[PDB]
Design a binder for this molecule. Structure first.
Ligand code: BUP
Ligand code: NI
Length: 462
């Protein structure tokens, strides 16, 4: 990804958002009860805690594009993953508007709680004005789609979220880059069935863990990834993807039987316009970050990357014996024998992708289930039933999260949510958590769920 040009809104004629540049995250009742050092992210250019220029720090994620066109390694990788998909028999025919907007059993309805994007968010029009789940009416959508058309700019804004104190100083906030409701609807009409099958089939056929339920899916992973595991963290994955990866995704999409009309929508993702407050700019390469109607494609592209890195680093490596799942940038993969992570990372460097192995370290050793991280979570076999695997969210993260709130009226719900995460760390850990909560009068007034009861309901999921 790389910005091509920037122009002021006055020049382009694009509507300005505002924004309401103030954090909604306030310290919660447990702020000083628990330990942590994460504050709300930097929202405006004038933030007192800034070390650098904010606006230019924001866009330093676009490291540039190295390759524009698939070489022989990328094509072979795209074909293998394409071939592997075929067994899923993905329905390539356009999904109706009604289903794309209001949901099926394997595809969730468009979230009515997010902004509708350009120009709706700028015009005060929100999704509730257009969509109604009770009526399931699409005529008002077709109307607004008629009015504004497709290929609209992505309304871009800073994500109001907790960040490390280092990222606040260095000004590395994260952007929500939201597509226009119009393009969401159209994209989901073209690829809605693909999303459906993917959602319904987390695992090694799809190569995806998108929409999985870590509570149950965790136990399936050791079986789905036998032999020697490998994994790593990407640095700025989304913005580091060059147009080559979108080209390779087009190849994959064509090979599984998509029309050219549907396939031409991928260029609208590769080459994007954005509006950030009162300046508009053009991005070539790079996956738009904000929304989730982009998660599946990221996971697919990652399935291409991993394959393309393997066959380029190791002559005559066997792609039929690779197993992987990806949720965006996050990848868990395995192979019959171990793989040099530092050699992959240098092959990835050729394609403009920053990779550092998930450890210290500076590499794998060899990274198996004990230290294995996926979707932040670790993997812990159940004490009594070792074949059942707990997803372990690190207490470190849970502590950071409890110390802040966006709405003070939501302390009960927010805590329960964290408890549903916490207990997987074990009975000893959970007691220590709940007692620190009950270390304060407000905590003792709360309905904190019982350990063995939580375990009970978990067992009943198997
Ligand atoms: O709303 C959102 N949700 C979301 O999951 N991302 C995801 O974060 C990634 C970029 O964010 P980092 O830079 O904070 O973490 P990294 O690990 O990639 O870099 P470093 O930890 O080495 O600094 C992107 O590749 C997206 O996949 C981005 C946005 Br925006
Ligand atoms: Ni452009």
């Amino acid at each position: 990804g790389e910005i091509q040009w920037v122009k002021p809104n006055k020049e382009t004629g694009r509507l300005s958002i505002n924004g309401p540049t103030r954090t909604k995250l306030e310290p919660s009742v447990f702020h000083d009860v628990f330990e942590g050092n994460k504050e709300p992210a930097v929202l405006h250019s004038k933030d007192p805690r800034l070390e650098v220029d904010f606006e230019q720090a924001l866009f330093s994620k676009y490291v540039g594009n190295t390759l524009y066109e698939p070489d022989e390694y990328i094509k072979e990788a795209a074909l293998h993953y394409a071939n592997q998909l075929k067994q899923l028999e993905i329905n390539t025919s356009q999904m109706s508007m009604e289903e794309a907007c209001y949901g099926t059993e394997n595809l969730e309805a468009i979230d009515l709680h997010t902004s509708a994007g350009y120009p709706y968010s700028a015009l005060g029009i929100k999704k509730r004005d257009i969509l109604d789940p009770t009526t399931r009416d699409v005529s008002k959508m077709k109307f607004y789609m008629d009015k504004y058309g497709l290929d609209l700019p992505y309304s871009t804004y800073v994500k109001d979220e907790l960040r490390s104190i280092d990222k606040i100083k260095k000004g590395k906030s994260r952007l929500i880059e939201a597509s226009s409701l119009n393009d969401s609807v159209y994209l989901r009409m073209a690829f809605g069935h693909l999303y459906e099958t993917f959602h319904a089939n987390p695992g090694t056929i799809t190569g995806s863990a998108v929409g999985c339920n870590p509570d149950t899916f965790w136990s399936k992973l050791p079986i789905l990834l036998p032999g020697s595991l490998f994994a790593f963290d990407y640095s700025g994955y989304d913005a580091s993807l060059s147009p080559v990866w979108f080209r390779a995704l087009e190849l994959v999409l064509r090979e599984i039987g998509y029309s050219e009309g549907a396939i031409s929508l991928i260029e609208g993702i590769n080459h994007t316009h954005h509006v950030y407050r009162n300046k508009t700019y053009c991005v070539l390469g790079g996956m738009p970050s904000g929304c989730s109607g982009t998660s599946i494609f990221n996971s697919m592209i990652n399935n291409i990357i991993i394959r393309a890195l393997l066959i380029k680093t190791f002559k005559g490596i066997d792609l039929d014996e690779l197993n992987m799942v990806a949720y965006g940038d996050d990848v868990l993969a395995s192979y019959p024998f171990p793989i040099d992570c530092l050699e992959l990372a240098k092959t990835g460097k050729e394609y403009g992708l920053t990779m550092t192995p998930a450890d210290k370290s500076p590499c794998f050793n060899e990274v198996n289930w004990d230290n294995a991280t996926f979707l932040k979570r670790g993997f812990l076999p159940d004490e009594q039933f070792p074949f059942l695997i707990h997803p372990t969210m690190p207490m470190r993260e849970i502590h950071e999260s409890i110390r802040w709130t966006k709405d003070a009226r939501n302390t009960q719900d927010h805590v329960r949510s964290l408890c549903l995460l916490a207990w997987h760390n074990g009975k000893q850990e959970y007691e220590k958590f709940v007692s620190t909560i009950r270390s304060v009068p407000v905590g003792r007034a709360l309905a904190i769920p019982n350990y063995e009861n939580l375990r009970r309901n978990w067992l009943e999921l198997f």
